[PDB]
Amino acid sequence: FSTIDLLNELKRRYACLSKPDGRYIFLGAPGSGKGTQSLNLKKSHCYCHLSTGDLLREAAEKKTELGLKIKNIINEGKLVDDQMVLSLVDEKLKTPQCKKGFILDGYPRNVKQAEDLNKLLQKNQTKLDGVFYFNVPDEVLVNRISGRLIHKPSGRIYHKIFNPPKVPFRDDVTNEPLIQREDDNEDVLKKRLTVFKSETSPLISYYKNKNLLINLDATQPANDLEKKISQHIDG
Ligand SMILES: Nc1ncnc2c1ncn2[C@@H]1O[C@H](COP(=O)(O)OP(=O)(O)O)[C@@H](O)[C@H]1O
Ligand SMILES: Nc1ncnc2c1ncn2[C@@H]1O[C@H](COP(=O)(O)O)[C@@H](O)[C@H]1O
Ligand SMILES: [Mg+2]
Numbered sequence: 001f002s003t004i005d006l007l008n009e010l011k012r013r014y015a016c017l018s019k020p021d022g023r024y025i026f027l028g029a030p031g032s033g034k035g036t037q038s039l040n041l042k043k044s045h046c047y048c049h050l051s052t053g054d055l056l057r058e059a060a061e062k063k064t065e066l067g068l069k070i071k072n073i074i075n076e077g078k079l080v081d082d083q084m085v086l087s088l089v090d091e092k093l094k095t096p097q098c099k100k101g102f103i104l105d106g107y108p109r110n111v112k113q114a115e116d117l118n119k120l121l122q123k124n125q126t127k128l129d130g131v132f133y134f135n136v137p138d139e140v141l142v143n144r145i146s147g148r149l150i151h152k153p154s155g156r157i158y159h160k161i162f163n164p165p166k167v168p169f170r171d172d173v174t175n176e177p178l179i180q181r182e183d184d185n186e187d188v189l190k191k192r193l194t195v196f197k198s199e200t201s202p203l204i205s206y207y208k209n210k211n212l213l214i215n216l217d218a219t220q221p222a223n224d225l226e227k228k229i230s231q232h233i234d235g
């Protein structure tokens with residue numbers, strides 16, 4: 001590790017340290033690009049990526065009664081109990097990775113969860129900076145889910161077409177195998193999009209009333225959408 005390489009690390013470090021702190025919510029149906037954009041901000045703004053889906057799939061891996069309960073709810077495309085998710089969010093929000101800021105990706109998924117989050121932020125003396133809505137049509141989301149591949153250890157997201165890996169079905173960093181999410185099966189994605197429309201769509205109006213909603217056109221390329229999000233934050 002050279003002096004030039006050492007000084008260049010500092011340049012990179014001082015670029016994200018100089019970025020504003022932020023506490024945002026990414027709202028949008030599965031395949032909208034929430035996880036993609038959360039990984040971008042984690043790199044550019046050092047914001048914590050709080051994914052309830054990731055935390056619950058992790059909880060679903062445990063060979064306990066609670067584990068089977070979560071695994072079966074997840075695989076059916078339905079929502080886990082509000083009290084359970086709240087405890088996971090309350091715990092991750094305490095971690096030191098959330099001091100610069102965070103991205104809530106997958107939470108809140110209903111009006112009740114939005115109220116719990118509100119009470120939790122009030123009691124913890126922390127405030128949301130915005131709620132980004134990933135506006136993308138249903139037809140687009142179908143293809144987005146179909147081609148999705150993830151590297152389970154890192155949570156890096158790929159798409160067979162829109163974001164392909166260097167070598168098929170292998171991670172770009174570790175060259176380790178990729179996986180298809182069990183909930184990305186055609187029939188359960190249909191149930192997931194239904195749950196979104198019924199339980200999560202009223203949050204658009206809820207956060208618009210709270211004057212926190214920021215509309216995004218999530219159908220644009222990922223690198224273009226990244227700049228648009230960064231523009232709302234740093235601008
Ligand atoms: N702007 C985009 N345009 C085209 N494909 C995208 C875009 N953003 C993400 N993708 C791909 O489509 C799928 C969306 O994944 P993801 O970001 O995890 O959505 P979500 O987190 O909302 O479920 C992934 O396979 C990803 O590689
Ligand atoms: N906020 C939440 N409330 C309840 N269940 C959730 C929540 N987030 C994720 N889950 C469960 O885990 C899945 C993960 O979805 P995703 O957010 O797309 O990773 C969902 O389909 C639900 O089964
Ligand atoms: Mg599957």
Ligand SMILES: [Mg+2]
Pocket residue numbers: 231232233234235
């Ligand atoms: Mg702005």
